């Protein structure tokens, strides 16, 4: 612990071409380990990680039925949103759904997450409470209003708290060889010359969760501004990879160094340029 | 509403010439879905380039990696080209070893 | 496992 399990359904409308694209993926953690693609020849949910192969022909016979449902379930969503948006049957739309537990270190349940997007923004999402929904426009209103009604909010609470919760911890099980690893950041220093200037540049590579912080300090205190960061990239082997950068004088750079904060350290790491 | 894509090219593996590695692009922070990428050597686009499966951000947006195996040489060219709707020519970023 | 979803 803690862990979370995370799906993400796609539809993507394709006027005159054919039917919409319809998307799933499914992750523990950082580790995607199903996918559903209807663009696919025989689309079916598949394992995307070794350790999910394991699952037998019955339990991917019902993920590919509960796909291919929310497939039709998103194909009709799209048709509806076009009338509450008044647009045209001519133009290409998106629907995103996005859902979730989190189990604790124990693990028993911590959160539960549901949220929706229309064209890349947020449309109706369930609240901390898994009890009520916070709409984004005047069509969430209309589609709030008849979820109020159908009781939806109960049927997605029960699911996130319980169905939601045993299996996750049924895959953390499966997949405890490697999902419980904590692969702390393997980390060094680059030096690199410029107006009479030197470029330091931390790294982290080879870590696993993905979650990092790398901060350059100097004399105790952080280098907030005039500190270049690249976003948290995938290795593509289950690794991620970071790098932070700072713009320090030429001949000046055992002044400072690079505090890598990972859960898989004990405690943080301390580093600087090494001639 | 559309987000062009933003593009990482890089290493699996600190890299050393002559030693065989992989190259990844990680094209991330782009609306709507569909996109198309290439990877290129020396100009010409790599035959074998293998996709992961989309995903998006708790922002909403897409994300993607697309990877190739390659051997870098200190001439040899390395780049992601990228079409998506939100742009009216191909985005190219060049791989730089240092970064 | 997933669940279903209900029509907007
Ligand atoms: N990991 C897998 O099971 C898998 C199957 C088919 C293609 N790529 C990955
Ligand atoms: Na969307
Ligand atoms: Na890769």
Redesign the interface.
Known sequence: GSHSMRYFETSVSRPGLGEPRFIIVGYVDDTQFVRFDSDAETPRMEPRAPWMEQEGPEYWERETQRAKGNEQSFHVSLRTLLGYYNQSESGSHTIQWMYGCKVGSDGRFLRGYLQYAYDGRDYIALNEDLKTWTAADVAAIITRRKWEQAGAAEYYRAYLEAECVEWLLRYLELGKETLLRTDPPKTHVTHHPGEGDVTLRCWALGFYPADITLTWQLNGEELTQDMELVETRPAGDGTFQKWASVVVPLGKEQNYTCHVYHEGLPEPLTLRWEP | ?Q?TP?I?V?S???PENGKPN?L?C?V?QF????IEIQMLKNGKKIPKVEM?????S?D??FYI?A?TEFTPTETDTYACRVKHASMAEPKTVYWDR?? | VGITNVDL
């Open positions: 509403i987000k933003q990482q890089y699996r593996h600190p992989i990844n990680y991330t609306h709507p879905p569909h992961s499966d989309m995903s998006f708790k909403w947006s990696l990877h240092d970064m």
